Amino acid sequence: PPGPPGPPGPPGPPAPPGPPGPPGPPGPPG
Amino acid sequence: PPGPPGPPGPPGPPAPPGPPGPPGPPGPP
Amino acid sequence: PPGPPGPPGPPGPPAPPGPPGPPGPPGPP
């Protein structure tokens, strides 16, 4: 007593919004 | 009773990618 | 009788970084 332990908990939440990516490639010719 | 609470559930799901990165440098002159 | 469900599991994996940015602006004339 109490009794047997309950089931595991639910899946956690997502991690916050991710960082932006790296810079794009160079621009076009002049 | 009730028995004690169960343990923590599993880690959360994968998240979406972050936002696009900054434009790159000016092209060639 | 078995106790209550366990608490929520921890945060998921870090959301990846975003896709690369766009090409830059044209170069000097």
CSV table of C-alpha atoms in Angstrom, one decimal:
chain,number,residue,atom,x,y,z
A,1,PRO,CA,0.0,0.0,0.0
A,2,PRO,CA,-0.4,2.4,-1.9
A,3,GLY,CA,-0.5,-0.3,-4.6
A,4,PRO,CA,1.5,-0.9,-7.8
A,5,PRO,CA,3.0,2.2,-9.5
A,6,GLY,CA,1.0,3.7,-12.4
A,7,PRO,CA,1.9,3.7,-16.1
A,8,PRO,CA,4.7,6.0,-17.4
A,9,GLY,CA,3.8,9.5,-18.3
A,10,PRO,CA,2.9,11.0,-21.7
A,11,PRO,CA,5.5,12.0,-24.3
A,12,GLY,CA,7.0,15.4,-23.5
A,13,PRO,CA,6.4,18.6,-25.5
A,14,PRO,CA,8.6,19.8,-28.6
A,15,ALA,CA,11.8,21.9,-28.0
A,16,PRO,CA,11.2,25.6,-28.8
A,17,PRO,CA,11.4,27.2,-32.3
A,18,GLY,CA,14.8,26.4,-33.9
A,19,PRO,CA,17.7,28.9,-34.9
A,20,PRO,CA,17.8,30.3,-38.3
A,21,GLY,CA,19.9,28.6,-40.9
A,22,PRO,CA,23.3,29.8,-42.1
A,23,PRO,CA,23.8,32.5,-44.8
A,24,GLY,CA,22.7,31.9,-48.4
A,25,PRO,CA,25.3,31.7,-51.2
A,26,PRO,CA,26.7,34.8,-52.9
A,27,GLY,CA,24.6,37.1,-55.2
A,28,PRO,CA,24.7,37.3,-59.0
A,29,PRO,CA,27.5,38.9,-61.2
A,30,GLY,CA,28.0,42.7,-62.0
B,1,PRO,CA,-4.0,2.9,-2.7
B,2,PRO,CA,-3.9,4.2,-5.3
B,3,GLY,CA,-0.4,3.0,-5.9
B,4,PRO,CA,2.2,5.7,-6.4
B,5,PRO,CA,2.3,7.7,-9.7
B,6,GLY,CA,4.3,6.1,-12.5
B,7,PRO,CA,7.6,7.6,-13.7
B,8,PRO,CA,8.2,10.3,-16.3
B,9,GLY,CA,7.0,9.6,-19.8
B,10,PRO,CA,9.4,9.6,-22.7
B,11,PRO,CA,11.2,12.5,-24.4
B,12,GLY,CA,9.1,14.7,-26.7
B,13,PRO,CA,8.9,14.4,-30.5
B,14,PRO,CA,11.4,16.1,-32.9
B,15,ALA,CA,10.6,19.7,-33.7
B,16,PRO,CA,10.5,21.5,-37.2
B,17,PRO,CA,13.6,23.2,-38.7
B,18,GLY,CA,14.3,26.8,-37.7
B,19,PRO,CA,13.6,29.6,-40.2
B,20,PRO,CA,15.7,30.4,-43.3
B,21,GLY,CA,19.1,32.0,-42.8
B,22,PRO,CA,20.2,35.5,-44.0
B,23,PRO,CA,20.8,36.3,-47.7
B,24,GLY,CA,24.5,35.7,-48.6
B,25,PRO,CA,27.1,38.4,-49.7
B,26,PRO,CA,26.7,40.6,-52.8
B,27,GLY,CA,27.6,38.8,-55.9
B,28,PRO,CA,30.7,39.4,-57.9
B,29,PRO,CA,31.3,42.8,-59.5
C,1,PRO,CA,-5.2,-0.5,-7.5
C,2,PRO,CA,-2.2,1.2,-9.4
C,3,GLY,CA,-1.6,4.9,-9.0
C,4,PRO,CA,-2.0,7.8,-11.5
C,5,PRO,CA,-0.1,8.2,-14.8
C,6,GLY,CA,3.4,9.5,-14.5
C,7,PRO,CA,4.2,13.1,-15.4
C,8,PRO,CA,4.9,14.4,-19.0
C,9,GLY,CA,8.3,13.4,-20.3
C,10,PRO,CA,11.0,16.0,-21.0
C,11,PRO,CA,11.3,18.4,-23.9
C,12,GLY,CA,12.1,16.8,-27.3
C,13,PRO,CA,15.3,17.1,-29.2
C,14,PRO,CA,16.4,20.6,-30.2
C,15,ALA,CA,14.5,21.8,-33.3
C,16,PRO,CA,17.2,21.9,-36.1
C,17,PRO,CA,18.6,25.1,-37.5
C,18,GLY,CA,16.8,26.5,-40.5
C,19,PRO,CA,17.5,26.0,-44.3
C,20,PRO,CA,20.2,28.3,-45.8
C,21,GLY,CA,19.2,31.8,-46.6
C,22,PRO,CA,18.8,33.0,-50.2
C,23,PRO,CA,21.5,34.1,-52.7
C,24,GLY,CA,22.8,37.6,-52.0
C,25,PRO,CA,22.2,40.8,-54.1
C,26,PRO,CA,24.1,41.4,-57.4
C,27,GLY,CA,27.7,42.7,-57.3
C,28,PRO,CA,29.0,46.1,-58.2
C,29,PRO,CA,28.3,47.1,-61.9
